[PDB]
Write an enzyme that holds these catalytic residues in place. Structure first.
Site, mmCIF file in Angstrom:
data_model
loop_
_atom_site.group_PDB
_atom_site.id
_atom_site.type_symbol
_atom_site.label_atom_id
_atom_site.label_comp_id
_atom_site.label_asym_id
_atom_site.label_seq_id
_atom_site.Cartn_x
_atom_site.Cartn_y
_atom_site.Cartn_z
ATOM 1 N NE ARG A 93 2.301 0.555 3.579
ATOM 2 C CZ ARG A 93 3.450 -0.096 3.721
ATOM 3 N NH1 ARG A 93 3.782 -0.603 4.921
ATOM 4 N NH2 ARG A 93 4.265 -0.243 2.664
ATOM 5 C CD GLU B 34 -5.548 2.571 -6.935
ATOM 6 O OE1 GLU B 34 -6.172 1.548 -6.583
ATOM 7 O OE2 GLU B 34 -5.511 3.603 -6.228
ATOM 8 C CD1 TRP C 121 -6.931 9.353 -2.079
ATOM 9 C CD2 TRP C 121 -7.997 9.502 -0.093
ATOM 10 N NE1 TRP C 121 -6.042 9.853 -1.154
ATOM 11 C CE2 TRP C 121 -6.668 9.960 0.062
ATOM 12 C CE3 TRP C 121 -8.854 9.515 1.026
ATOM 13 C CZ2 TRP C 121 -6.174 10.423 1.294
ATOM 14 C CZ3 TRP C 121 -8.355 9.985 2.258
ATOM 15 C CH2 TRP C 121 -7.039 10.433 2.372
ATOM 16 C CB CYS D 231 -0.992 0.043 1.222
ATOM 17 S SG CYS D 231 -1.959 1.592 1.248
#
Ligand code: HEM
Ligand code: HEM
Ligand SMILES: Cc1cc(N)nc(C[C@@H]2CNC[C@@H]2OCCNCCc2cccc(F)c2)c1
Ligand SMILES: Cc1cc(N)nc(C[C@@H]2CNC[C@@H]2OCCNCCc2cccc(F)c2)c1
Ligand SMILES: C[C@H](O)[C@H](O)[C@H]1CNc2nc(N)[nH]c(=O)c2N1
Ligand SMILES: C[C@H](O)[C@H](O)[C@H]1CNc2nc(N)[nH]c(=O)c2N1
Ligand SMILES: [Zn+2]
Lengths: 411, 409
Positions: free
Chosen positions: B111, B285, B280, B108
């Site tokens: 973070r 992506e 979000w 991730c």
């Protein structure tokens, strides 16, 4: 053991058995993966197994495993090792070994080409002047007026580690870097330390943005000596853009011949500390890394300025836009000058075909995903979606530390 | 034991000691690196050391390590496991656990946000209809009219494993995919299988290109049931381009709320098999992966055509030019409609800053470089040049396989 890799775009699944032949350590354990870490005299005892393993591989490849010629060669090498603590490769074994070090180089996207490698045997070299001549000949041969041909030149192997041959340059052709009093750098900031070494050794620096560095060559463990590559042997490409006429006035150029000179070649336990090799560029190496890394030529801002891009917010993607245009320029420029180059799309597609072939005929293809995926447009290349297994096979190329840290200056 | 990570752009070297608290297997060995491989009950005896390990870190975190309240709780939990074969987390433990599972998520990039996570405790949920209500409320809370807020909703923990809660969907909000008699795919090709199971369960498919799937919810190990998220809770964004008037005519939209719903949350040995979470989007992506993967909406060819680029040869970089434009359109569209989004430059800069805090305050930060580096323009982002160590800490999120393989109807 049978390990599977999947391609997440095609659902093609491959089975690796070649990893069973792997000996050396990766840096990773069951508890920690070091896949993004850049850097993760033998005795006679350890040398004969290594020699035997290699010769066994060689003789199997020529379909003569177990033959009298194979057995006789094992006996000959064993007798050479016990008596002299080392041994000499036959020319056939040396060629086989250098081609296989390339085939085995997991960070190399260009490996479809591995079996076409011109090997220049320089094991009779004794002095730095001699190294200079061999390197000039390599460069001229590899360059071939723009029609690049892969090649490697192999200097004498390590004996006691006190008599090493080394090329001090990290690549045969690179540009100088000069750190200015105001903390700016003129030229290639990656080469500042080495440029200072050269200057200290007597090089008269032109002090421009693209000064081809002299060779610094070490023979037989002696202090290294400086030589200037004949400028007429150093093919360069001025960089221009197919649509943007202002692109030429950036004053950019690059050299045509990428030639790695700081790696160590291991074949059958023997160590070749000077083994410069060359192929041709993938465009992103120059256009993404050499030109756009913040620590290298760092031209993104200037290019984006000239394109009149919105530079107030990163979310306009001005850096990404400028990056593509620079990479179009590099490919256009090399192509228009008929200097061999490959785009990242073509190269990665060929790599996938190579990998699939290798899985079928060899049982695997070790590959380092972190390095194989290009440094722009990652997921629009097929390699992004391909799972890979990274492991170490011999013969192999290995990184070795810069010689200025380790050399015993004799004066 | 003390491992160094170097940043090759900045020369900053950091020392990792956090990896020594690492527990589970990476899939790598001394002989083989599986860094690029996507996929590399608890008895009373296994459960107590897991609980103790977690409770120790928890009591440590609130600076009450080795205190009476610490020992009392370890005692209480031990009693409960021995007598009941499991235990229940206190609300404080559950909040801490969920935040730390995010903190520990090596793949991730976002973070830096990990401590700002709204945790919705849905452990009192008993039916699939209750699950649906909790999920709409999560959706509305997280969406917040486009001013997105990170949240997780945590359904009851696994017991004997025959009574699992599962959200069958991979994300709360996704688009349907349908195979065509023509041979091609309409909608999201990624969701073809799930959509068939939806129709097979009764869903009346609209058969369009952007049909929000219904939820398939499984409570207490029963057969999953179908629920449609209220259309007015699903915030969607029409995709247009700031320069190209023609871009809007492709008819592209995406949803504002990325909400992963197929992972397993492990805290102190307890396993939460339904724990949908949302933050979000990072723009790549949608723009790089959802739109441009060949196995997805695969729209590069159409966009390149409307830009009238030279498509005869790869070396013209037409794919790369069109890719940038699609990603410019995604970010511009979200920003114009006031829906939170972050570009890959900003997210990766934030992550480098987060890594530096975590090294100084925690002694490390597990990170998976293969996932962290954005799928376009990798080396112009600072994470490309940063060495990372990947290792598994708990509490954790783990991928779990689609339940339609597991389930018996
Ligand atoms: C024929 C053209 C070739 C192409 C397009 C090519 C492509 C590349 C690229 C893009 C890289 C990564 C470079 C970097 O990021 O620094 C690389 C790495 C490498 N290649 Fe090739 N390659 C070619 C030929 C060769 C040859 C002839 C050899 C040796 C005989 C070789 C051996 C290696 C090795 C050892 C590395 C890793 C270098 C390192 O660790 O710094 N390659 N290749
Ligand atoms: C606040 C905004 C957030 C941003 C910008 C963000 C960024 C990302 C990105 C870009 C990925 C890779 C996505 C992919 O390629 O599929 C990812 C993965 C992941 N993130 Fe985040 N994240 C955010 C919030 C969260 C939250 C709230 C959680 C949990 C509470 C979380 C946990 C995870 C996990 C477990 C993965 C790996 C998912 C998988 O294996 O499929 N993230 N993050
Ligand atoms: C620290 C460290 C370790 C390592 N293994 N390697 C390095 C060289 C770095 C890698 N990335 C930039 C620089 O390498 C720059 C030169 N790389 C060219 C590779 C190449 C391409 C085409 C044809 C060829 F014959 C060779 C540094
Ligand atoms: C096989 C497999 C394993 C795995 N761990 N994961 C997957 C989901 C894939 C990964 N890559 C695309 C798709 O996942 C898409 C969903 N990812 C969004 C992550 C995210 C972003 C922002 C905020 C959030 F709360 C969450 C598949
Ligand atoms: C830290 C990280 O491993 C490092 O920046 C790598 C990433 N991938 C790379 N890939 C290639 N081909 N060349 C490189 O120099 C690098 N550098
Ligand atoms: C095979 C490879 O591991 C796979 O394509 C990965 C690469 N990196 C990724 N990175 C992110 N963030 N998300 C992904 O889905 C993937 N896919
Ligand atoms: Zn690994």
């Amino acid at each position: 053991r049978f390990l599977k890799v999947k391609n997440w775009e095609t659902d093609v699944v491959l089975t690796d058995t070649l990893h069973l032949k792997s000996t050396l350590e990766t840096g990773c354990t069951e508890h920690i993966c070091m896949g993004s870490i850049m850097l993760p005299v033998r005795t006679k005892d350890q040398l004969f197994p290594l020699a035997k393993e290699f010769l066994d591989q060689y003789y199997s490849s020529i379909k003569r495993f177990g033959s009298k010629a194979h057995m006789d060669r094992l006996e000959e090498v064993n007798k050479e090792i016990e008596s002299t603590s080392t041994y000499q490769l036959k020319d056939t074994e040396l060629i086989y070994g250098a081609k296989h070090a390339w085939r085995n180089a997991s960070r190399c996207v260009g490996r479809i080409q591995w079996s076409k490698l011109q090997v220049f045997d320089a094991r009779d070299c004794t002095t730095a002047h001699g190294m200079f001549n061999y390197i000039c000949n390599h460069v001229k041969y590899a360059t071939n007026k723009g029609n690049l041909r892969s090649a490697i030149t192999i200097f004498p192997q390590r004996t006691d580690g006190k008599h090493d041959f080394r090329v001090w340059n990290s690549q045969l052709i690179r540009y100088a870097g000069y750190k200015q009093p105001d903390g700016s750098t003129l030229g290639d900031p990656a080469n500042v330390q080495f440029t200072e070494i050269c200057i200290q050794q007597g090089w008269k620096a032109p002090r421009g943005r693209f000064d081809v560095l002299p060779l610094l060559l070490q023979a037989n463990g002696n202090d290294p000596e400086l030589f200037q590559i004949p400028p007429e042997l150093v093919l360069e490409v001025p960089i221009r853009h197919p649509k943007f006429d202002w692109f030429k006035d950036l004053g950019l150029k690059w050299y045509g011949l990428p030639a790695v000179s700081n790696m160590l070649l291991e074949i059958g336990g023997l160590e070749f500390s000077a083994c410069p090799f060359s192929g041709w560029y993938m465009g992103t190496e120059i256009g993404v890394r050499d030109y756009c890394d913040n620590s290298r030529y760092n031209i993104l801002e200037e290019v984006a300025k000239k394109m009149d891009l919105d530079m107030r917010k990163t979310s306009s993607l001005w850096k990404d836009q400028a990056l593509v245009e620079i990479n179009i320029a590099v490919l256009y420029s090399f192509q228009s000058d008929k200097v061999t180059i490959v785009d990242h799309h073509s190269a990665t597609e060929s790599f996938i075909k190579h990998m699939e072939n290798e899985y079928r005929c060899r049982g695997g293809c070790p590959a380092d995903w972190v390095w194989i995926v290009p440094p722009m447009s990652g997921s629009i290349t097929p390699v992004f979606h391909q799972e890979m297994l990274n492991y170490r096979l011999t013969p192999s190329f290995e990184y070795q530390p810069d010689p200025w840290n380790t050399h015993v200056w004799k004066g």
